[PDB]
Amino acid sequence: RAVAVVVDPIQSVKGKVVIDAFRLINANMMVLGHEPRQTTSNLGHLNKPSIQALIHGL
Amino acid sequence: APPALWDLAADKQTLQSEQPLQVARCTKIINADSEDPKYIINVKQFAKFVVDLSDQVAPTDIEEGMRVGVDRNKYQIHIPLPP
Amino acid sequence: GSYVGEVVRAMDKKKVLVKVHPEGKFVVDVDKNIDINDVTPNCRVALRNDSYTLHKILP
Amino acid sequence: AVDTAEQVYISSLALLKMLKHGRAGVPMEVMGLMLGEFVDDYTVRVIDVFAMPQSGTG
Amino acid sequence: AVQKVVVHPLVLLSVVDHFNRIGKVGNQKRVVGVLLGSWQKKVLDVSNSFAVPFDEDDKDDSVWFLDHDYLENMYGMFKKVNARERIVGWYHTGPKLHKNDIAINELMKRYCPNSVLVIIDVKPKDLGLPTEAYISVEEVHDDGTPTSKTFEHVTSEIGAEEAEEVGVEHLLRDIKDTTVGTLSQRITNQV
Amino acid sequence: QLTEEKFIVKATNGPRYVVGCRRQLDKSKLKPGTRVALDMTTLTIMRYLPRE
Amino acid sequence: EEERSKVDDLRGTPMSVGTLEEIIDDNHAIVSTSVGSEHYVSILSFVDKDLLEPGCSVLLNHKVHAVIGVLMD
Amino acid sequence: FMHCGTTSDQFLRDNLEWLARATNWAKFTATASLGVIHKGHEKEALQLMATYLPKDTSPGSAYQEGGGLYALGLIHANHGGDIIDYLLNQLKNASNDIVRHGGSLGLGLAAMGTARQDVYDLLKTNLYQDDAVTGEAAGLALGLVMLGSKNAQAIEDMVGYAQETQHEKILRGLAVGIALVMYGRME
Amino acid sequence: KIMKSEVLRVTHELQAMKDKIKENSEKIKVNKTLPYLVSNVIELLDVDPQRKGKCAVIKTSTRQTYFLPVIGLVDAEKLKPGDLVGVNKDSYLILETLPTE
Ligand SMILES: [Zn+2]
């Protein structure tokens, strides 16, 4: 599993404490579809990281 | 684009080769050297820096006021260059 | 916030060179909901500061 | 060849350890370790989180 | 000497951890954690703490078990990661002050400086403030009774620094803020 | 100084900011004409900066 | 066609216009800009490198400045 | 939706390359939707599910089998000629979380409303491994089987089984599980 | 010599102190590894009314001014308004000062 988390209160305001846990994809999964994650309900909540350079920029 | 065709097929290994060769601290030239670890260096943006030599370059391959390739992350001297 | 783009020349490959504040001159495709030909060159526009997508023409 | 739908359980223990660690989020890179138990494939629970002393390497 | 203390909610949340890491044994005693804080200013400021395996006897109160090596190692590694905070005192989570607590206190009066004691509650059913700072001082008595270690209450406030406010307020979404006017005034004026 | 607590600062590098007052220090040295010292976090004032 | 449209990531939003200084036979050239940023990348497609006529303005990035193409003027 | 009841596999006879192309739960939902297509067939259903790999008798993907039972329960919903007797020996077969999960779904759905204490019992030992997905199926079947029965130790068994675990799919499966039992207990 | 046999505990304390200076002296090498840039120093004594006033004025080579007290190790040939000093990344501290010319 090997969870990786970045806390960054420096540019995070005191109103929201938005933190995210990040993941590594396998490099051999590039031929198939990227993330075969079932139960796609919560991804509407996972599009809250929508900064227009970092999330889909990287 | 036909010259960029075979090079476009040769752009596959440029992604596995993009993780090496990436480093450039704007090719800072040195000024002097106080002792064989510590080198007094100046970047072109007028910030005087000090870093140690890496293991890949000999200190006899250090020349006074030399433009060389140098890291922008660990800041060490990966490879030199002739001019 | 976001930056202030100024297009000086529109490029025909739908990748508009835009004159930016120093260390700028960032050539980019602007957002898909806005057409390229409406953006007239030598006029100031509204540009995002990272994603480099145009909002509107400015006087 | 399998992947599932995982979701990360976060206590306030780990949270305020990352917030004391975020007050310890001065400009330098800081280090810490997340602990807990993996009960299945697709759920993950954190309990124990501590910090690590800094180094000039980061 | 010291007028007031400041205890951050992080350590009491680690007393929630004291009631987490039990493992269901049937003991649930006054588990002592090693209180850390800032005695540096005249006000005492608790930042964080840890806990130590502590056992008493069923019948005998005066049997009590601590560790110096665990104190110097956990405090050593903690001082290695953060030397801006030092040892200050301790606490038991039991509701009752035992006779043994002068002797249990005496170990951290020796090796640490004048240590503060905190009585808190195992079950937070008390409407009152759970934390009471009891200064460990010997006071001379007018009746002529011999001088002993006496636990006088030092007044306390529970404050959070910056991010503990944000994380707690994000975790709740149930508490309402200051909100002067009808409601937050009149509810205090209710109860 | 607009609010007696909170005023305008002028950095050496050029950008201007507004800061608060620390609970320890008082308004004696905080009068204008005083070059001060600031922090990256919260823009607090630990002490001032005497010119020379 | 997909390989023609896979280098779009480099010429996308992370793209800048720099000024080339010289072309090096070690295939990593040295560039410049308003601060004169010198970054050397082993070359990529769409560049001419002979009629490129060094000392001119070329196309750079917000990324590692891999030269994805050139633009005449 | 469109091929329900008309038993038309002929749309899904266009290709094998668009169905089995991914080893995932998508094949389980594909075999399930195959169960939605045809219904009410006492020989050709089990025969047709047996037709899919009677070669080595070892599916590399278990979702064909567990979708065979989950589909089969969709076929035999409220049939009086239940093959439930065979599916107890088929749930007696040792397999991980597809005979357990899909076997709980299909077998409990075919046993819907019967209020049998036996399928109640094997349902309990299906949920006693504390896994979220197969016990989620155990709750979903348990609401089906206990319709109107209102067994006394069952409700306190479910809510007493609820707070003693940190898994969440056991909580929603027992959520619907204690939901469906309560019918006409308005009073 | 019974009164002088308490000296043994003192010597075990002090050789224990020599056992425990190895780690906090060991972090000297990993914190003070690379002074990354060169920054101009201007010495300016402060007054705090211990609470003693002691300060210096810094200027980076990229001409950015920050604030700091007199810090580092025991200084004799330091305290000069000079250059070629030791500094970490954002700590902006003084660790190793050297003469430029
Ligand atoms: Zn960094």
Q: Measure CA of the first residue to CA of the last residue in chain F; give whole Å.
A: 23
Please list every residue in chain G whose beta carbon sits closer than 8 Å to the beta carbon of residue A31.
Answer: none
**Residue of A55, A54, A23, A19 whose CA lies nearest to A37:** A23
Task: Say if residues I90 and D28 touch (Cβ distance below 8 Å).
Answer: yes
Burial of G30 (0-12, 13-18, 19+ CB in 10 A): buried
d(CA E37, CA E116): 10
Out of E47, E48, E167, whose CB is closest to D15?
E167
Q: Which of D13, D34, D52 to mutate to test the interface with A (most CBs of A within 10 A)?
A: D34
Question: Are the CB atoms for B57 and B48 separated by under 8 Å?
Answer: no
Question: Is the Cβ–Cβ distance between D13 and D49 less than 8 Å?
Answer: yes
Nearest to D44 among A1, A7, A38 (CB): A1
> How far apart, in whole angstroms, are the C-alpha atoms of residue F52 and residue I56?
12
- E strands present in I11-96: 39-43, 56-60, 67-68
E100 touches chain D (CB under 8 A): no
Could you give the CA distance from residue I45 to residue I79 in angstroms, rounded to a whole number? 10
Chain H environment of A32 (Cβ under 8 Å): 22
Q: Is A33 on the interface with G (CB under 8 A)?
A: no
Minimum distance, in Å, between the CA of residue C59 and any CA atom of chain A: 26
Q: Contact, F50 vs F33, CB < 8 A?
A: no
The first and second tokens of residue H167, run together, are 């898994």
Helix (H, G, I), strand (E, B) or coil at D48: strand
I61 and B46: CB-CB below 8 Å? yes
Q: How far apart are CA H184 and CA H186, in angstroms?
A: 5
Per the CB < 8 A criterion, the answer to whether G13 and G36 are in contact is no
Show the DSSP H helices in chain D as ranges.
12-23
Burial class (CB in 10 A: 0-12, 13-18, 19+), I33: middle
The answer for residues whose C-beta is within 8 angstroms of residue B39's C-beta and 6 or more apart is: B30, B32, B33, B50, B51, B52, B53, B62
Q: Which two tokens stand for residue D21?
A: 């660690």
Q: Which residue has the tokens 């007018």?
A: E142
- E77 interaction partners in chain D (CB closer than 8 Å): 53
Q: What is the largest CA-CA distance in chain H?
A: 56
Angstrom distance (rounded) from CA G25 to CA E151: 82
Residues of chain D with a CB closer than 8 angstroms to some CB in chain E: 12-13, 15-16, 19-20, 22-24, 47, 51-54
C-alpha closest to that of E55 among E89, E22, E31: E31
Chains A and C touch (3+ CB pairs under 8 A): yes
Q: Residues of G16-28 as b/e, b for ≥16 C-beta within 10 angstroms? A: bbbbbbebeeeeb
CA distances from I71 to A43, F47, H20, I94 (A): 51, 17, 69, 6
Method: cryo-EM
Closest CA in chain I for residue D27: I90
Is H172 in the D-facing interface, judged by CB distances under 8 Å? Answer: no
Q: How far is the CA of D27 from the centre of ligand 1 (A)?
A: 8
- Residues B61, B33 contacting (CB under 8 angstroms): no
Residue E74 dihedral angles phi and psi, to the nearest 5°: -65, -45
Give chains near B: 3+ CB pairs under 8 A.
G, I
CB contact at 8 A, I85 and I33: no
Q: List CB contacts (< 8 A) between G41 and chain B.
A: 21-22
The CA distance from H158 to H142, in Å, is: 10
> Half-sphere exposure (CA, 13 Å, Cβ side) for B11?
25
Q: Which of B20, B28, B5 has the alpha carbon at shortest distance from B81?
A: B28
In angstroms, the separation between the Cα of residue E31 and the nearest Cα of chain A is: 32
Neighbors of chain G with 3 or more C-beta pairs under 8 Å? A, B, C
The CA angle H87-H88-H93, to the nearest 5 degrees, is 90
> Inter-chain contact A8–D25, Cβ cutoff 8 Å?
yes
Distance separating alpha carbons of residues F30 and F23, to the nearest angstrom:
12
Residue whose pair of structure tokens reads 């400009």 in the numeric block: D27
Return the DSSP state at E38. Answer: B
Put simply, whether D18 touches A (Cβ < 8 Å) is yes
H–B touching, 3+ CB–CB pairs within 8 Å: no
Q: Are chains F and I in touch, 3+ Cβ pairs below 8 Å? A: yes
Token pair belonging to B62: 């250090």
Across the interface, whether the CB atoms of E167 and D51 are under 8 A apart is answered no
**Angle, alpha carbons B39-B41-B46 (nearest 5°):** 160
The single-letter code of the amino acid at C25 is: K
Phi, psi of E49, rounded to the nearest 5 degrees:
-160, -175
Residue of C nearest to G69 (CA): C27
Tell me the chain C residues in contact with residue G11 when contact means C-beta distances shorter than 8 Å: 15
Which residues are CB-neighbours of D42 under 8 A, at least 6 positions away? D4, D5, D6, D7
Best residue of H166, H170, H171, H172 to probe chain D, by most D CBs closer than 10 Å: H166
Nearest CA distance, D1 vs chain E (angstrom) = 37
Q: Angle, nearest 10°, between helix axes H132-145 and H101-110?
A: 0
- Of H23, H24, H132, which is closest to D40 when you measure between CB atoms? H132
Asked if A7 and D21 come within 8 Å (Cβ–Cβ), the reply is: yes
Name the residue with tokens 């920050």: I66
- The closest alpha carbon to E117, from E44, E172, E9, E183, belongs to E44
Q: Nearest 5°: phi and psi at G32?
A: -155, 170
Whether the CB-CB separation of H136 and H172 falls below 8 Å is answered with yes
Secondary structure letter of residue A47 according to DSSP = T
DSSP G42: B
Question: Which structure tokens are listed for G70?
Answer: 């050139």
Under an 8 A CB cutoff, do B24 and G7 touch?
A: no
Contacts of C40 (CB under 8 A, 6+ apart): C7, C10, C57
Query: What is the spatial distance between Cα A6 and Cα D32, in angstroms, rounded to a whole number?
Result: 11
Longest Cα pair distance anywhere in chain G, in angstroms? 37
Q: Is the minimum CB–CB distance between I69 and chain F shorter than 8 Å?
A: no
Q: How far apart are CA H131 and CA B53, in angstroms?
A: 57
Torsions phi, psi of H41, nearest 5? Answer: -135, 120
User: Do G17 and C25 lie within an 8 Å CB cutoff?
Assistant: yes
**Residue numbers of B between 46 and 65 with CB closer than 8 Å to I:** 46-52
Cβ–Cβ gap D3/A42 under 8 Å: no
Phi and psi at H179, nearest 5°, equal -75, -45
Q: What distance in Å separates the CA atoms of residue A3 and residue A19, rounded to the nearest whole number?
A: 13
Q: Are strands D7-9 and G16-22 parallel, antiparallel or unpaired?
A: unpaired
CB D16 within 8 A of CB E13: yes
- Closest CA of chain D from A8, distance in Å: 7
- The Cβ of residue F52 has, within 10 Å, a number of other Cβ atoms equal to 8
H25 in A contact zone (CB under 8 Å): yes
Q: Please answer whether residues H142 and H157 qualify as being in contact, where contact means their C-beta atoms are separated by less than 8 angstroms.
A: no
I73, I74, I65: which is closest to I92 by C-alpha?
I65
- C-beta atoms of B21 and G38 within 8 A: no
Which residues 1-58 of chain A have a CB within 8 Å of chain H? Answer: 32-33, 36, 38
E60 CB near a chain D CB, below 8 Å? no
Judged by CB atoms within 8 Å, which residues 16-55 of D form the interface with H?
A: 39-40, 43, 45
Radius of gyration of chain E (CA): 18
Most distant pair of Cα atoms in chain I: their distance: 66
Torsion of CA H38, H39, H43, H49, to 10 degrees: 50
Alpha-carbon gap, residue H22 to D2, rounded angstroms: 10
- Touching E (3+ Cβ pairs <8 A), the chains are A, D
In this complex, which of H23, H24, H166 lies closest to D39 when CB atoms are compared?
H166
CA pair distance H72, H67, nearest whole angstrom: 8
Put the strands of the sheet holding C43-47 in their side by side order.
C6-7, C43-47, C54-58
| CA separation for the pair E38, E42 (Å, rounded) | 9
H or E element that contains H60 = none
Q: What does the CA dihedral H155, H160, H162, H165 come to, rounded to 10 degrees?
A: -160
β-pairing verdict for F45-48 and F36-38: antiparallel
Q: Which one of I46, I64, I65 has the shortest CB-CB distance to F50?
A: I46
Are E96 and E45 in contact, with CB atoms under 8 Å apart?
no
For residue F24, give how far its alpha carbon lies from the nearest alpha carbon of chain I (Å).
Answer: 12
> Distance between CA D13 and CA E164 in Å, rounded?
11
Q: Are B11 and G42 in contact (CB under 8 A)?
A: no
- CA D29 to ligand 1 center in whole angstroms: 7
Residues of chain D found within 8 Å of residue E14, distances taken between Cβ atoms: 13
Structural tokens at position B82: 């002739």
Is there an interface between G and B (3+ Cβ pairs < 8 A)? yes
| Residues facing E153 on adjacent strands | E134
**Whole-number Cα distances in Å, A4 to D31, E142, E143:** 12, 63, 64
